Every structure is written in C-alpha cells, then in structure tokens.
Design an enzyme around this catalytic site. Sequence first.
Site, short mmCIF file in Angstrom:
data_model
loop_
_atom_site.label_atom_id
_atom_site.label_comp_id
_atom_site.label_asym_id
_atom_site.label_seq_id
_atom_site.Cartn_x
_atom_site.Cartn_y
_atom_site.Cartn_z
N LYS A 3 3.93 9.09 -64.55
CA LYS A 3 3.79 8.86 -63.12
C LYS A 3 2.31 8.88 -62.70
O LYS A 3 1.49 9.50 -63.38
CB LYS A 3 4.59 9.93 -62.36
CG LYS A 3 6.08 9.83 -62.61
CD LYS A 3 6.71 8.74 -61.75
CE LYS A 3 8.19 9.01 -61.52
NZ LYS A 3 9.00 7.76 -61.54
N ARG A 43 8.74 18.68 -66.31
CA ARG A 43 8.69 18.61 -64.86
C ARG A 43 8.34 19.94 -64.22
O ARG A 43 7.90 19.96 -63.06
CB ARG A 43 10.03 18.12 -64.31
CG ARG A 43 10.39 16.70 -64.67
CD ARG A 43 11.88 16.59 -64.93
NE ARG A 43 12.26 15.29 -65.48
CZ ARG A 43 12.70 14.27 -64.76
NH1 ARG A 43 12.88 14.37 -63.46
NH2 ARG A 43 12.99 13.13 -65.38
N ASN A 75 7.45 12.88 -58.82
CA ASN A 75 7.99 13.36 -60.08
C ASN A 75 6.91 13.40 -61.16
O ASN A 75 5.86 12.76 -61.06
CB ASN A 75 9.14 12.46 -60.52
CG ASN A 75 10.12 13.16 -61.43
OD1 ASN A 75 9.88 14.28 -61.89
ND2 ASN A 75 11.24 12.50 -61.70
N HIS A 86 9.61 9.87 -65.84
CA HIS A 86 10.90 9.21 -65.65
C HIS A 86 11.41 8.77 -67.02
O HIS A 86 10.65 8.19 -67.80
CB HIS A 86 10.80 8.00 -64.72
CG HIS A 86 12.04 7.17 -64.68
ND1 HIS A 86 13.16 7.53 -63.97
CD2 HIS A 86 12.34 5.99 -65.29
CE1 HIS A 86 14.10 6.61 -64.13
NE2 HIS A 86 13.62 5.66 -64.92
#
Lengths: 51, 201, 241, 239
Positions: B16, B110, B120, B123
Amino acid sequence: LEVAIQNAKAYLLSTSSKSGLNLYDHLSKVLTKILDERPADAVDIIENISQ
Amino acid sequence: MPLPQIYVEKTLALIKPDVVDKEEEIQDIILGSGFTIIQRRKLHLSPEHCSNFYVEQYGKMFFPNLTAYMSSGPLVAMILARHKAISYWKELMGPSNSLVAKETHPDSLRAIYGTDELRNALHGSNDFAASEREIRFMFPAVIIEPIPIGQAAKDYINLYVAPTLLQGLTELCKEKPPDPYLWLADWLMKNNPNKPKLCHF
Amino acid sequence: MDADSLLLSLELASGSGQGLSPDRRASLLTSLMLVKRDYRFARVLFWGRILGLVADYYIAQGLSEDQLAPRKTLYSLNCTEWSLLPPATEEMAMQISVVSGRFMGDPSHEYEHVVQIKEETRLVSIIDQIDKAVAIIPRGALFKTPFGVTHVNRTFEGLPLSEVRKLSSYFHFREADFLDSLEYDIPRGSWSIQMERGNALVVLRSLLWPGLTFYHAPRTKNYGYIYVGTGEKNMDLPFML
Amino acid sequence: MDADSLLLSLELASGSGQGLSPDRRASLLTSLMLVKRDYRFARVLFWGRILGLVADYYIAQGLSEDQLAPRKTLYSLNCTEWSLLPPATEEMAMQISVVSGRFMGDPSHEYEHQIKEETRLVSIIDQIDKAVAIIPRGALFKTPFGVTHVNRTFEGLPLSEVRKLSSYFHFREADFLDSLEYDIPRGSWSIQMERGNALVVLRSLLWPGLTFYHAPRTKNYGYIYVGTGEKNMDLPFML
C-alpha cells in the site's frame, strides 16, 4: 499422456555422434549450473551457460 | 494435479502507498518466511485503473475513499510462489480491520504496518480464481497454471474469439489481397467487438 | 584485495583510511607477481598490513585450485621480499594465551610466556584467527560442486541492492547454503554496514577485529577484503556495543 | 568510460597523460549522477575532452536500452551544468569541412569560413564516434528482439587474440559488428600494453587523442578521447 512422456524421454535420450552427449544430460548439467542461487536474470545467459 | 505434473500456486502481494517507503524490511519478512519473488512492478494505480481492478469489491460496495487512497502514491505488486501459499499468506498476513488486528494478532503484518481499515498495510488475494484475475489484470503476459487443455480452451476461443475470426475470414476471402497478414491485422484492429473504432486526423 | 586489481580497488576511498603509499603499492604489484610466479598459486589476494610498533607487517595470501584449503600466507617487512609462513594449528595458537599487546618488527623477537615465544608463530597464528573469525566472503561468489573441489564463480554478479544491508547475504570465508552465515555472530551487531558514495560502495567493517574492511561495489567483480589494524582481538566489543 | 573507471583514475594509467583532475573527477561523478537522474539513460559515459583555447570542453554521452541507438551526447564547460547537444546530420557534417582551425571555447563563437561552434562540436563528435569508437569481442550481445544489450557474462579478452587485430569492433551500426582490420588505412591504431598484462592500451591515429583501456581478465572497457579535436589526414605521412 504417459506414452507421449516415454516417447519424448526416448527422443531426449537420443545421443549425437558429432558431440558424444545427448540433449537430456546437457539440459541436466545446464539446470545444475542454473539452480545454484544466481540472480533472477538467467534468460539472457541460458545460451552462454550452454556454451 | 496428477503424478508427473505439479501445481505451483500463485498469489498477489500488494504494498500500500503508506508503506512503500518501508519496503525493504517487509521484503526481508516475506523473503525470509519462504515466499519467493517472481516479478516486482512499481506501478502508479490510476483512479480509473483501480475500479477495473476492484470490480469484485468496489463494484457492489460503496467505498470511494480506498479508490482515492490507491492513487495517493506508488503501489508495489509482486507474485509469490510457496507450498500452501494462500494458507501461509493468510496466516502471516492475518485478518483485516487492523485496529482489531493490533489486539488479536500482534505478530501479523497489519498490526505493525497498518493503521485502520481504509489505510491498510497490504492486500492479498483470497481465492485461487480471484488470484488468477488479480494477476491477469495487474501483470503482463505470464502463464498461470493450470493450462486449460482439451475442450476448455476450445470453448474459450469458440465463444470469445472465433465468431470475430469467422467474420474476419469471411471478408478476407473476397477479395484476395497479397500478403493477407496486413488485411487480417487491419480487420482485427478495425472491426474489434471489444474495442471501439478509431479515426485519426 | 586481488593482485590483478590492486589499483582497481578503492583502498584509501573505502573510508577506513588505512591504505598504502605508492611505494607500497608498486611493491605489491611487482612482489605479488613474483609470488604468483615462484609459488604456484591459482590466485593471490593481498590480505592486508599489520601496523606493528617498530615496523609494518605486510601480509598476503595465496590459494590453490581447491579454493577452500588453509591459505599459504606470506609476510614481508620492506614489502618487497616475501617468504612462506609455517602452517598453523590449534595447539600452537594456544601458546600466546598468556601474552597480549602489539608485536614489532623482526620475527626473531622472543616473548616471555619461561618458554621463549617467537614473533613469527604469534604472527601466523593471529593471521589464522583473523581469517577464521572475520574477513567474510560475499554471497554467490562460491558455488558448490558435488565433489570437494570448489570453484570461484565466474558468473558471480551476485548481490542485489535489497540484499546489501542484510546480515544473511554474507558468509564466513572458512571451511565448515555453503558456509556459516553472518547471523551466527557473537555479539549480535559486530559488523558495521555503512553506505559510502550512495549505492556505489558498501563497507562491512569488522568490530571484533578492527580495522578490517570488506570491499564492494555491487554489480561487480570486487569482491575483496583488507585488514589493516592494531593486530589484537577486540575483547572490549560488547561494552561498546 | 563509466563513472566506475572515473573512480579508479584509469585515464592517467592508460598512458595518454592528458588525463583528468580530481576537480573534474568529483565533478563528473556528481554531475553524471545528475545526468542519469534527469535523463533516463540506461548507462551514462564520460565521453572525453575537446582541447580548447579559452575554455575546456567536457563531453559525456548517454545511451538507451538499445546499445546501438543514436546517443544523446552532452557538453559542459564548468563540469556541473550539462546541456543536451543536438543530433548530427550529414548536412552539418559537410558544412564544417570548410573550417580548419583549433577548437576555441565559448560555444556562441562564429567562424567566417556563418558556421556556429556548437555545430562544429556536434559534427566532430559524430565523426569520432563513427570512426574510432571501440567495442571488444563479446562485450555487446545482439538480442533477437532487435536491440543490443550489454553482455553481462562477458569474460575478458584472452592474451592470444589481443594482437591480431581482429578482436575489436565499433560502437555504431554495422561478433555482429565490423572489425578493426578493415579500417582505412591499415595500422592506424597504436597497439600497446601497460605494466604486465593487466591493461591493453589502444590509441587512435586517425584521431590523435582517444585511448582505449581494456583489462584482459575483467569486464573493464571504455573509450575516452582527450585531444586536439582534429582529424589529421597527415597519418599516411606518419607511417
């Protein structure tokens, strides 16, 4: 098919009189020199390892 | 699937834009765990490219903030191969909602690299068909196993390509130009069912 | 530091600042060509110089085709005439456990244990300790044959920029993946990884044996190392770490 | 030559002796890092120096992914401000043939034989690059995609075929390039070696001032031209 597997293995196992080695052991030694931890750009050098 | 063949499954790891500057440490984590790097792409995800990538989630759920979030910076996409890659990637990655994942799975990715739901850390693909769709959309012309041998690919051509090929080869017979590769290529780029007509000036 | 690329290696520019004069450099090219002639070595690396107290101890090593044998190291005082050192063992290297400090000049200095301890045997055993503990090999430079003969990798690229900072991408140049990694290190953090000139140089400076310098660039072909230092082990290291 | 050879100070060790300064060594290192930053070249080489009368010319070249592509050469005077030279045509190549005289400096200089100084610099650069640029055997690999890439498994030239002269090619459009044995006239290359067999020195005689270093056991090569900026047609009188 397994009959095609055996036919292609017999085709790769066929030797050449001009070199004394077959394609199967040549590609096996090429894969032996490949599978040591070289950086992942061996696509341009797969010829040069065969020479 | 059978004895003389093997099944090396693939999954997509997404980095991300908040965590792309910290890429070396998480790269150490994912390489040291056992996942291998096939090809890494540094891609700027367009807002008009994120929607076609996320027709599965954004097409039915109203969430434009994540669509604006994917265009806020660079995005790194990588292909992973591992024995039980999906299960081990879900175990190392952990579940979503990183505010809760900071308390439930403190060793997950995470919990350290994430802040909230929409911002986030990463993914990952869930299903194998979703993994195939994600890899086929983001990445260039690579081969994903299984090869659909037999009647699977013939039906794909006969209901996706060969109507257009029949209409192309019908007009290619009358008349007969020399070197018909020009005529076939111009017909496919001109009479495209999935691409509109182009008129340069 | 290879003998064919001594001028092609950034020695003074490595950041340690313990290099050579032009006198010592030209003496190493001529004399290492000489010890490549009369001693049948596959390749000769300049190991480094020990500073000493009254004279400098220039040390160079030579290697055979087996590439994993104990090194037939050589020493010099005026950096011109080189002679072979005796091979080392554990019982002979045990003998200097009752003495410490720098060592000076001629090999005929007798040390008090009273058993007289020669300077030469202390020098070659200390060379063996610095070879065993530090002076790492880079990853991909040593590939493995099915037999016991190891060849130097002619196709060595071999370190990406993402693996430059890692400890696990360096192995110890010592017969024992192939070799023992640098994460098997005591204490944890005994190597200084440092970024000079951006990505064009990295130094793995040893802190257990200073001032050892490991010599990159990436995208290369050097693949070198050099120890210039006081000569004794840094037993002070976990206090300063 | 790349910036790696600028680090080793290999221009003086080649023996030409016109060389480079640590002023210009640090300036080329930082400024060619800038040239690799602003213009997206695959590799950036310090081309060399053109000898001046009021200012010194410093020339570097950039290359794309195709190694035989037309290069975007650059010039600088104070060794930091690199500026892009235009590409050369044949119309500018036969234009500068009526001007015979030393390279002056101050690139807005005008020749009465008007004719701009920058056009002379660019046409001279294309003349040297088409004539006496040097690539050894196996340094460049002709890919079947149609482009040329650097051969990264290039083992250096063995000592048997250093002196043939059939083991050095040209760095332009034509073992797929034209060799040095067909150069006109024959014997127009100063074949030399350094101390030991550690470096092979080739000096062009159709253009006095280019030097080619080559270590025979490692992948170290490159051409630097520092010299007058003139093609001597007096070379058959010399030999």
